[PDB]
């Protein structure tokens, strides 16, 4: 019927936007991480620790949105 026409667009928009956000944010962060490392090797591990701290806050809302995208595409669609 007409439901299945919309549901997958209503999912794909969510997931494409989450992808844009996650990738752009993680790259903006990872660039500052890397060029910082290249200054001072043997500061690499501490910076990587802190990078993994900060990455966990970036992937929060995008991953909520991906979870709901998968909900719609399979709990509904």
């Amino acid at each position: 019927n007409l439901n299945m026409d919309l549901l997958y667009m209503a999912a794909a928009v969510m997931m494409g936007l989450a992808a844009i956000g996650a990738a752009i944010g993680i790259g903006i962060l990872g660039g500052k991480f890397l060029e910082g490392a290249a200054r001072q090797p043997d500061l690499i591990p501490l910076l990587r620790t802190q990078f993994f701290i900060v990455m966990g806050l970036v992937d929060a809302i995008p991953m909520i949105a991906v979870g709901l995208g998968l909900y719609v595409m399979f709990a509904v669609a």
Partner: protein
């Protein structure tokens, strides 16, 4: 330090000719000061030019 940059002044290169900045008094009566220095110099400028290198003063 924790990293490095590389200026010419920091890294050796093969010595083809050498420079000297020579410090000397302006006044006499200093005793043997100037000539001990100048002979010590001349000995080593000789030692260097025994290896074909020139000197610049």
């Amino acid at each position: 330090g924790n990293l490095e940059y590389k200026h010419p002044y920091l890294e050796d290169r093969d010595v083809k000719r050498v420079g000297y900045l020579v410090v000397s008094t302006d006044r006499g009566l200093a005793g043997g000061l100037n000539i001990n220095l100048f002979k010590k110099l001349l000995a080593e400028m000789k030692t260097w030019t025994d290896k074909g290198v020139q000197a610049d003063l």
